[PDB]
Design a protein around this ligand. Structure first.
Ligand code: DMA
Ligand code: DMA
Ligand code: DMA
Ligand code: DMA
Ligand SMILES: [Cl-]
Ligand SMILES: [Cl-]
Ligand SMILES: [Mg+2]
Ligand SMILES: [Mg+2]
Ligand SMILES: [Mg+2]
Ligand SMILES: [Mg+2]
Ligand SMILES: [Mg+2]
Ligand SMILES: [Mg+2]
Lengths: 283, 283
């Protein structure tokens, strides 16, 4: 039972969905299909957890959540574009995502490539759109810089590349964690740091804490994902294989605890971040 | 005979090549192949004309050319990433570019997808890298915003999408120009506007002139490209087909003239921009 988190997710998804709407109107008829493809790729069925994170970090520091609209859109658009390319035939070659045809299936491969390309750019536009933030010049430099680092070849793209190059190879835990830290950790950290920055009230100490929280939940998610695949398996390169199931479950709990410890400096305004940490390993 | 332009191209290419070197060192062994793929994609044999444009616009306004290093890198990296995805099997399915194997041929498709993805991000990092510019907060907001608009779905990516969706269709001149304006015009304009902005001395009037120049040379290039394909054809949807060869050649001259007219407000510091305009339609 996680009532307030369900309500927080709902408000988070509504706010970022309405914010994004303004981004996806093609400027002309010739551009309509590309914009439709991008829209399709964002209507992917996700829970907008990265926007959730942006908004929650903003409010933890005292900002109005809408101050983080630019951040929330930007991280969701980065996340969207990553999934579209990830599904491509040359990559994971998936026909479905969350029950629906993937973008290259609903459209075609060439459209899907570009839709992903278009979405990465729009993510940066969104971050700087004055309708989406009121942030000050240097804060927004911090934010833009951050997003590019987190999404690029030393971040999420790097993580995808590590994934490809790990096909075959026998990974240990340190290598598995390195790969996850890049593939999904980076953008999760960016989510919380961008949200915090967006409040205008962010101090060095507070960002450190939030980065610690974010690193912890990013790993907890991947550990629990593996645990759930195993448990669903005994229903009808992974953490359980490396550690054994029992030990994997404890690891996930220790990470949830490290995440909650990181949030000790904050007041009740940080409760959604705390409830998410709990949910990730409870789910 | 275009002696000073040859020397300008040479200095332009050396400066941006040295500037980019600092970007392409992988932070770890696991990331080496991705960074190698990106490097490969930038060592594509091009003349760095977009960097040329950035540096020339900067110097036309009185800046030291290195002030535009961030701009020059960013537009070349955007240009690089566009070619890698453009060559992909789902897109143009080219095995060679300028005589060399394309990135998906030297590496594989999945690597090439990501290399293009990584390069788009690095382009934004480069633009904000303090080693590459000294520009002030609001100027650099103008620049970042500009690059995202020019490269994204209302710009170059849009142009690629128009290209795909024009397969088949019978284009008139107005539609052909609309497609070119997006596919290559946008990023050319961005090149000159980013360079100008990078000087710190850019005024509204001067940017207008440079945008006019850039729009004109962007079209002149595409018209002359078509003319050269025809002339090489009688050696051993296009402008010549739409207009006839004779008329296409005149059109290219009228565009060169519109470009040079746009530069009337500037002194001798704008000569490289003038010599490029001449070269494009003389070549
Ligand atoms: C800790 C965290 C961000 C988990 C996100 O899971 P996901 O990537 O499947 O999220 P979404 O449902 O937003 O796609
Ligand atoms: C950054 C990114 C796209 C991660 C998805 O990785 P994956 O292919 O292992 O996960 P999924 O099951 O979502 O395809
Ligand atoms: C007017 C202009 C920018 C022409 C560029 O030609 P190109 O795209 O082939 O340039 P490069 O040789 O730099 O790839
Ligand atoms: C933005 C971009 C990649 C343009 C290249 O278009 P093209 O495929 O018509 O030209 P090329 O002959 O270089 O592939
Ligand atoms: Cl639309
Ligand atoms: Cl390297
Ligand atoms: Mg994958
Ligand atoms: Mg996948
Ligand atoms: Mg897993
Ligand atoms: Mg093409
Ligand atoms: Mg091509
Ligand atoms: Mg042509």
């Amino acid at each position: 039972h996680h009532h307030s988190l369900t309500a927080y997710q709902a408000s988070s998804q509504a706010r970022v969905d309405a914010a994004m709407h303004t981004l996806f109107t093609a400027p002309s008829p010739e551009l309509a299909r590309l914009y439709e493809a991008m829209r399709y790729s964002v209507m992917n069925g996700g829970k907008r957890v990265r926007p959730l994170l942006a908004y929650a970090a903003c409010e933890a520091l005292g900002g109005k959540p809408e101050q983080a609209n630019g951040a929330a859109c930007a991280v969701e658009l980065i996340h969207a574009y990553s999934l579209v390319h990830d599904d491509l035939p040359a990559m994971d070659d998936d026909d479905l995502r969350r029950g629906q045809p993937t973008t290259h299936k609903a459209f075609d491969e060439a459209c899907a490539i570009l839709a992903g390309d278009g979405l990465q750019s729009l993510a940066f536009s969104a971050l700087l759109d004055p309708a989406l933030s009121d942030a000050s010049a240097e804060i927004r430099l911090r934010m833009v810089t951050t997003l590019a680092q987190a999404a690029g070849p030393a971040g999420m793209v790097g993580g995808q590349a590590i994934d490809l190059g790990s096909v075959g190879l026998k990974l240990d835990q340190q290598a598995l964690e390195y790969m996850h830290r890049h593939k999904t950790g980076a953008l999760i950290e960016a989510s919380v740091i961008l949200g915090a920055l967006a409040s205008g009230r962010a101090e060095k100490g507070e960002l450190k804490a939030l980065q610690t929280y974010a690193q912890a939940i990013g790993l907890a998610f991947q550990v629990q994902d593996d645990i759930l695949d195993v448990e669903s398996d005994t229903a009808t390169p992974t953490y359980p294989a490396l550690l054994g199931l029992a030990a994997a479950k404890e690891y996930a709990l220790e990470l949830r605890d490290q995440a909650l410890h990181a949030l000790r400096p904050f007041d009740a305004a940080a409760e959604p971040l705390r409830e998410l940490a709990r949910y990730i390993v409870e789910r």
